[PDB]
Each structure stands twice: as structure tokens, then as C-alpha cells.
Amino acid sequence: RDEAGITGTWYNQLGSTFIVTAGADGALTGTYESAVGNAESRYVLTGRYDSAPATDGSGTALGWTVAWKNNYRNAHSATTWSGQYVGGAEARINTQWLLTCGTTEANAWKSTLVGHDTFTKVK
Amino acid sequence: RDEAGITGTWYNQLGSTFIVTAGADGALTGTYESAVGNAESRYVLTGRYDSAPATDGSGTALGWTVAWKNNYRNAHSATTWSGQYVGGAEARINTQWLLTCGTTEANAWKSTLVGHDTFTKVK
Amino acid sequence: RDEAGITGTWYNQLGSTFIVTAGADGALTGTYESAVGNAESRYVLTGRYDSAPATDGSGTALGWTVAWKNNYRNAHSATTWSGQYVGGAEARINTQWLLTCGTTEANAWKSTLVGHDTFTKVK
Amino acid sequence: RDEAGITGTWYNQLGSTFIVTAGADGALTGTYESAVGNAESRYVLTGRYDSAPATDGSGTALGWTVAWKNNYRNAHSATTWSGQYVGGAEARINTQWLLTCGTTEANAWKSTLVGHDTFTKVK
């Protein structure tokens, strides 16, 4: 249990801010603020993490979702991050993500972006 | 608002069962039961959806996460689905997903599977 | 060796046409014509396939690339398909793909689409 | 045209070596040696790149495939890298990749890994 290790404020390589609380039972709750794209201010996030990881030096699997609707903007889109927490002096969350736009059927082939974000506790 | 359209039981092409409730504010909550892999019985899911989609025939963006720990098994892994709800007589949720395993650093290159699931309200 | 099984004309769910020759040594060469996007007429493709697959009922791994430049248009982008050939009366090539646009550094986060195409020998 | 910029030896973060020649017409040809996985020595690669990129500071889209069969080993799998070349004093190729294994139909859900590699001209 990395409940303590995961809870807090994280920053990615784009300068986005991910604020999360890890629950004892596996829940992730918080807010996400993107430095890029059709986004302003904070958005609700929720997700899950493995609350009883392997003790063999493996990371801790987790994921979360943001739907890009808040009181300011609606980008008609959602991102999910899937990744792992790695603890220690340079803790990180290493993720891959999928961002789906709501599209017509004709445009569904071009609905989903993929990328990768690495989160740290500094900067 | 597809709060009503999205809430309920869905089935994918693998025979997995996704039971979800859509909240007015954008929340998704429920359970997931995989027909395949290192899984048994139900797992908690959470996610988000666009509660005010475009009215131009576009789908409704959404996503959710399952961490593959329950009272029965722990697969030290998490899947996120990112996709869109499309309503009407043959409603569907069309997704792409990322499944991350907790791994050592040496094995992190091989940590993440990607695939695609389509959910329907029958079968 | 599925040199014979793979060589020929294939069609995907979008109505795109993939014309390929499989070489004895593993090469794939041909042309691709997309039914969608910033594309017209045929584009060169090249790729590779496993020329000595497992004999246990497994599929045949393969992949190919199209850069979306031809004499007609230049979409400053490239798609790679990664997948497997499955032979028999309803032969198919089942793929996932990544389409990268050339972007500025500022826009690199939004450079890559992901999707999935299934190719058949009819329609 | 980055025919000159792209041709040569590149190294990724895993310590893999990618040796490529860029043709005037868009072709990529060469060899790949993975530092990790079920691989030994060099494998043939082929791919494509945009031979007439935008002149607005954008990168150069490209992709390539390796099928993991050579005289030494056959991993019954293929990787495709999709990405962009960015030139200048710290030139890089930034990619996302999909590695498909040949699988039975029952196991096709777990056939494809996704990841990201960054290639540089040093180390």
C-alpha cells in the first residue's frame, strides 16, 4: 500500500497538475488541470489503483479518467490514463493515455488520440 | 444527457459484463466482470462521462478504470477504457483500452496491452 | 508460410483497399487507398511479416507503414498497422494502428491517433 | 527533405540500435537490434517517411516495421513504430509503437503491447 505514496500533487512533462487522494479500498479521487488543449481550470477525476501490490520491486498499477467538462468549458472528450506508480526518492507515475472525442459515426476513425505522460512530485 | 441511455448492463464481444450507473454530474460507478484473463467475479469500476454532449449527432465521450483486485484475486494490473456512447436502437459503447501491469523497471517496456471493446445492451 | 494467403487485395471496414505482395523472406510491398481522411488514390506501403509462424493455430504477425504522400496530396503523416493474419474460409487481417502527424513540439502531445482496422478478402 | 538527417544510426532509451537509410522517394530500409525481449542480433526493417515535410517547424512523419524473425530466433511477433523526426542539434525520432504477437483467437485480446521509444543520435 502506496496510499500515502500516491496521495498528493503531481506534475507532468507538459506542466499539467494532477491532485489525487488514494483511498484504502483502491479509490482514486481528485482534480486535473491540463496545461494544454481545450481546457481551463480543474476537472474532476476518478480512478482505481492496486491497494495490495506485489512486494517484488514491481510498480503499482493504476488508472484514472477525466471527462473534459467543467463550469468553464466542455471539450466533448475524455482521457484515461493507465499506468504504474513507482515509489522511492524519485517517485513517478508512468502512464499511457487515450483521449476520445465524441464524434459522428463517419468521423469515429479519427476519434482517439494516444500519448504518454510521466508524473513527478516536483515541477 | 444520456444519463438514462448509459445506465444499465452492457456486454462486450468477449462476453464480459459491465454494470454502470451514470450520475447527473458526470460520474460513472459500477462493476465489471471479465470473461477472460486473470479475473473472477466482479470488480469495482469508476469513471466519467460528458453529461452535456454535442447535439449534432456526435457520440458521448466517456471512460472508466478497473483495478484487477477484488476479494478473490489480485492481477496487479489496471485497465482503462476510453470511448464513446452512441444511442439509438442499436446503442453501443465503442472503446479502446489500455491494460497496465505493475512491473519492475526492467520490464516496464512490456507493461501495457492495448485493445478495443464494443459494448452492447444485448448478449 | 502464408506467402500465398497474405498476397492479394484486402478491404477494411471503412472501405479502404490494401493491395500487398508477401515475399518469401518476410517482405510486404504494395499500395494502400484510404476511403477516409486527407488521401486520394494509392500510396506506397512496405512492411514485414513472420514467414515461419507457429503451427499451433496461432495467427501470423505482421505490420506495414504508409506515409501519406503521393503525387496528388501530402498529409504530412504516416500510419503503421500492427496485427495478425488469420487464415481459413473467412481469412482476416486484424490490426491496430497508429497515425502520427508531423507537428510542432508544442503540439506533439496531440500528434498521434490510434484505431483498429479489420481486413477481409471480400467487400 | 530530411533524407540526410534521418539516415544513420540511432539509439533508444532501452539501448536498442536502429540503423536506417532514407531514400529520396520516401523509403526507409535498415536493421534493428533490440536490447530487450525475445531478440538477438539484427532484424530487417522497412518503412516510409514524408520526403517533403512542412516548412513551418513541424516534424517529419515516419514509420517502420520489424518482424522478429531472423536466422537466430523467431519471436512470432512484429513491432511497428509510428512517429516523427525532429532535426537540429539534438535531433530525435519520437515514436509510439505497437507490438503484435501471433496468437490463437482465444488469446487475441492479449495480443498487442503498446509503448513509446525516443531515438537519439548519441548513446
From Swiss-Prot, chains A, B, C, D:
A motif (Cell attachment site) lies at residues 48-50. It is found in: Secreted. GO terms for cellular component: extracellular region. The keyword Nucleotide-binding does not apply. The keyword Signal applies. Residues 3-123 form the Avidin-like domain. The biological function of streptavidin is not known. Forms a strong non-covalent specific complex with biotin (one molecule of biotin per subunit of streptavidin). This is Streptavidin. It comes from Streptomyces avidinii.
